[PDB]
Amino acid sequence: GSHSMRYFYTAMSRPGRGEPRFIAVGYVDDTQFVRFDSDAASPRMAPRAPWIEQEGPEYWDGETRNMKASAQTYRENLRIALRYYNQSEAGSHIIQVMYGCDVGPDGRLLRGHDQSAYDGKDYIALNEDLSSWTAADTAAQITQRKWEAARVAEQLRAYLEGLCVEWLRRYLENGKETLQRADPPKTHVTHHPISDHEATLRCWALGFYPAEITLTWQRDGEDQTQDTELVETRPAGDRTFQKWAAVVVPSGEEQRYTCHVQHEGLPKPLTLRWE
Amino acid sequence: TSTLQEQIGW
Amino acid sequence: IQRTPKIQVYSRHPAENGKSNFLNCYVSGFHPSDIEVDLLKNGERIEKVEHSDLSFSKDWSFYLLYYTEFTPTEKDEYACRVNHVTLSQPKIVKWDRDM
Amino acid sequence: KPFLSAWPSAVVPRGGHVTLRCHYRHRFNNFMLYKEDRIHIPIFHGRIFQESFNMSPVTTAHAGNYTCRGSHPHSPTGWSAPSNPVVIMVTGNHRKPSLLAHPGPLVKSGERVILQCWSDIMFEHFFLHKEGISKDPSRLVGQIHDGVSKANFSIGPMMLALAGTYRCYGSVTHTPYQLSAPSDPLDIVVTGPYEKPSLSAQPGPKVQAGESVTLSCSSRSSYDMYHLSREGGAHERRLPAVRKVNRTFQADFPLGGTYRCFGSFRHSPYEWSDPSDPLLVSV
Ligand SMILES: *[C@@H]1O[C@H](CO)[C@@H](O)[C@H](O)[C@H]1NC(C)=O
Ligand SMILES: *[C@@H]1O[C@H](CO)[C@@H](O)[C@H](O)[C@H]1NC(C)=O
Ligand SMILES: *[C@@H]1O[C@H](CO)[C@@H](O)[C@H](O)[C@H]1NC(C)=O
């Protein structure tokens, strides 16, 4: 299977409410494994998954210094953004960054990513070639010109081809029995009356990892994709996920409805029915 | 480092 | 470019009265990031509440999980109360064991 | 605990204005103020500020060390725990000191510079402060030697966040929150890592009075502005960059001495490119 590592940074100003804040989180696939928050009294990069906890002190010291520097860098970028957009220093603004790498089954790089946003809309992104930028507006075009002049893309490309891949591989090994072992969903169907002519059938999937899953309702073998209520996949809080799919069915027709579950932890796709 | 070590200004 | 939060309230494990469990309130799809979330037990704010580290989705909207350990009962009613800049008044979502 | 802040700056000239805000329980109202020595005695005879406290015009009496407490009706005491402390420093109360950079104001990325403050007035402390909103000043004790007091502020390894306009202040014994008039300002600019431009002379660097010579700064990089500097410390000339047909970006400075040019970008006046190679103009 393919895997990914991503870091997500959020830098926020909040004049009169607090000092600017920088939070970073790291994910391998759907599993968060580190965090850094500048608001802590003595901020440090810290483990958020058990399989990273036994990484040595040189790791934590190194990650902490980088985040402290990054926090500083992004505080300045917020100031810069104010100038680019001619905004007042009274307002609250947010920069978001996500970057990282995807690798294939052989552990080799498939794609690298580096995208930034200002106040929740695209600002600038590294292109798939990892050597050019797409800027979303005139403000971002200033940044692009700086980054081209400073050869930033080469630096990002070197990181993405090297350290990013190298560390993802390391983490995938460290956490193999959780990260590389899909847990299939536990499934069931519930029945809830609506009136005395109609009722709801709800197909449940619980305790699965990774988050990717497909729940479908069929009526005599035809998908009810137009008449299916699908809830957003949600975290259980123990590094597994939950989802359900609902369909409103006429009374006495419960038996023509089948729920179909697809997930990598399942040997064969499941077909459930209410009884 | 695992995180991007390069510091990048806008 | 302000986005109001989606809210789900649910337990970590299937609920069974008198058995220890976790109560979750997942807020997502919101922007900006400041948000206030409380879990309530019979209208009253629960004290020992923790949350996940702030992160966001591909569309830049944020998500957080708030959670507390709890033992469900027949009589006790649980909910999640969420305020955000996008909301004139706080939204309250009851925990329904069937949702 | 509340978050107390000074706007636009905690370092403020006599006659200026500064507003203290006490943010607590998602509001900015109903708070009391305290100064460092009296910790449970509200200032202004226990005035309950109904909104942010605007001090204007600022006087020396405003200088001080502040904390706030926010109203908290439904709690043991009427009020919150003390906020973080904010020091309002009032400037303009003594002759200005002097500020110089060693070896100079243009600092290569990753390198260091010394900012020395000095005065023939005996200042107990010196303060170094970068121009801008909500910025903290650095403090050092002054050291006496041969009729001056002085301090060395070390800045670096140099990066953008450290670049800008700096001023320094002294304060004298027994009035630690009262600062001098500011020193003359020093622009500290970071150079690099942006690629160096090319400098050339038209018709050439050999000129004899009184015929015209233009220096051109050029790059393939899309610089928005060029800065022409002549060794010997008169402030650089600046001109907008213009795109040429072969896609270079160029500015022409019509004017001896040894020159260098730097590129820079819109809204970014304190970060410049690596310096061009030097060009010697002779008259
Ligand atoms: C100001 O007051 C606080 C105590 O509230 C003290 O911690 C701090 O060191 C003081 N700052 C100065 C410059 O005195
Ligand atoms: C401060 O730095 C300057 C220049 O590097 C140097 O001349 C002097 O020795 C340093 N120390 C003091 C106390 O001035
Ligand atoms: C491009 O055009 C300018 C202006 O004519 C010319 O002087 C400059 O030398 C050229 N640069 C290159 C690299 O061709």
Tell me which residue of A65, A30, A72 sits closest to A45, measured CA to CA: A65
Tell me which residue of A131, A147, A149 sits closest to D221, measured CA to CA: A149
* CA D53/CA D76 separation, integer angstroms: 26
Question: Helix H segments across chain D?
Answer: 43-46
Q: Is D152 in the pocket of ligand 2 (CB under 6 A)?
A: yes
* CA A163/CA A101 separation, integer angstroms: 10
* CA D125/CA D176 separation, integer angstroms: 8
Contact state of A149 with D263 under an 8 Å Cβ cutoff: yes
CA dihedral A260, A262, A267, A272 (to 10 degrees): -20
What DSSP line would sit under D173-207, residue for residue? TT-TTBPPPPPPPEEEEEE-SSPP-EEEEES-SB-
Q: Are A145 and A124 spatial neighbours (Cβ–Cβ below 8 Å)?
A: no
**Structural domain boundaries, residue D24:** 1-93
Q: Are D32 and D48 spatial neighbours (Cβ–Cβ below 8 Å)?
A: yes
Q: Are A234 and A241 spatial neighbours (Cβ–Cβ below 8 Å)?
A: yes
CA dihedral sign, ordered D10, D14, D19, D22: positive
Q: Is D118 in the pocket of ligand 2 (CB under 6 A)?
A: no
End-to-end CA distance of chain C: 30
**Are D162 and D142 members of one domain?**
yes
| Nearby residues of A177 by Cβ (< 8 Å), 6 or more positions away | none
Phi, psi of A77 (to 5 degrees): -60, -35
Contact state of A75 with D161 under an 8 Å Cβ cutoff: yes
| Residue-wise burial string across A231-267, b where 16 or more C-beta atoms lie within 10 A, e elsewhere | bebbbbbeebbbbbbbbebeeeeeeebbbbbebeebe
Of the residues D151, D172, D192, the one at which a domain ends: D192
* CA A32/CA A50 separation, integer angstroms: 10
Q: Could you say which DSSP state residue B3 is in?
A: S
Tell me which residue of A53, A36, A28 sits closest to A239, measured CA to CA: A28
Give distance in angstroms: CA of C68 to centre of ligand 2.
Answer: 58
Which amino acid would we find at residue A258?
T
CA dihedral sign, ordered C48, C52, C53, C55: negative
Interface check D230 vs A, CB under 8 A: no
Instruction: Give the residue extent of every domain in chain A.
Output: 1-181, 182-272
* CA A70/CA B6 separation, integer angstroms: 9
Top CATH class, A1-181: alpha beta
| Residue-wise burial string across D133-161, b where 16 or more C-beta atoms lie within 10 A, e elsewhere | ebeebbbbebeeeeebbbbebebbebbbb
Interface check A134 vs C, CB under 8 A: no
* CA A113/CA C2 separation, integer angstroms: 25
Beta strands D125-130 and D138-141: pairing type?
antiparallel
CATH number 2.60.40.10 given to A182-272: yes
Beta bridge partners of D108: D191
* CA C52/CA A237 separation, integer angstroms: 9
CA angle (D251, D254, D256) in 5-degree steps: 115
Which amino acid would we find at residue D8?
P
* CA C9/CA A99 separation, integer angstroms: 31
Phi, psi of D27 (to 5 degrees): -140, 170
Interface check D51 vs A, CB under 8 A: no
Q: Are D155 and D72 spatial neighbours (Cβ–Cβ below 8 Å)?
A: no
Query: Which residue in this structure is represented by tokens 């002519």?
Result: A197
* CA A41/CA A28 separation, integer angstroms: 27
CA dihedral sign, ordered C39, C42, C46, C50: negative
Beta strands D257-264 and A121-126: pairing type?
unpaired
Q: Are A120 and C1 spatial neighbours (Cβ–Cβ below 8 Å)?
A: yes
Q: For residue B10, give the chain A residue with the closest CA.
A: A143
Question: Per the omega criterion (within 30 degrees of 0), is the bond before C32 cis?
Answer: yes
Q: Is D116 in the pocket of ligand 2 (CB under 6 A)?
A: yes
Quote the radius of gyration of chain D (alpha carbons, Å): 25
Q: How many domains does chain D have?
A: 3
Of A77, A155, A156, the CB nearest to B10: A77
Identify the contact set of chain B against chain D, taking CB-CB distances under 8 A.
7, 9
Which amino acid would we find at residue A192?
H
* CA A94/CA A81 separation, integer angstroms: 10
Of D159, D221, D266, the CB nearest to A148: D221
Question: Per the omega criterion (within 30 degrees of 0), is the bond before A210 cis?
Answer: yes
Task: Please give the order of strands across the beta sheet that includes D53-55.
Answer: D3-7, D18-23, D53-55
Beta bridge partners of D114: D102, D154
Chain D interface disruption, residue of A145, A147, A148, most D CBs within 10 A: A145
Phi, psi of A171 (to 5 degrees): -70, -40
Contact state of A147 with B8 under an 8 Å Cβ cutoff: yes
* CA D169/CA D95 separation, integer angstroms: 9
Residues of B in contact with D159 (CB under 8 A): 7, 9
Q: Are D161 and A75 spatial neighbours (Cβ–Cβ below 8 Å)?
A: yes
Chain A interface disruption, residue of B5, B7, B8, most A CBs within 10 A: B8
* CA D73/CA D12 separation, integer angstroms: 34
Q: Are D119 and D171 spatial neighbours (Cβ–Cβ below 8 Å)?
A: no
| Nearby residues of D84 by Cβ (< 8 Å), 6 or more positions away | D1, D3, D4, D67
* CA D16/CA A82 separation, integer angstroms: 24
Which amino acid would we find at residue A220?
D
Quick one: resolution in A? 2.0
Paired tokens of A132 = 């050019």
Which amino acid would we find at residue D5?
S
Interface B:A, ≥3 CB–CB pairs < 8 Å: yes
**Are D58 and D105 members of one domain?**
no
Which helix H or strand E contains A64, and what residues bound it?
helix A57-85
**Are D64 and D115 members of one domain?**
no
Chain length of chain C: 99
Q: Is D144 in the pocket of ligand 2 (CB under 6 A)?
A: no
Q: What SS3 state is found at C72?
A: coil
Query: What is C1-99's CATH superfamily?
Result: Immunoglobulins (2.60.40.10)
Which helix H or strand E contains A139, and what residues bound it?
helix A138-149
Which helix H or strand E contains A171, and what residues bound it?
helix A163-174
CA dihedral D93, D94, D95, D99 (to 10 degrees): -90
CA atoms within 13 A on the CB side of D8: 10
* CA A89/CA A79 separation, integer angstroms: 8
Which amino acid would we find at residue A124?
I
* CA C39/CA C21 separation, integer angstroms: 14
How close A21 gets to chain D, by Cα (Å)? 14
CA distances to A35, D211, D234, D252, D280 from D255, rounded to whole Å, are: 56, 10, 14, 9, 13
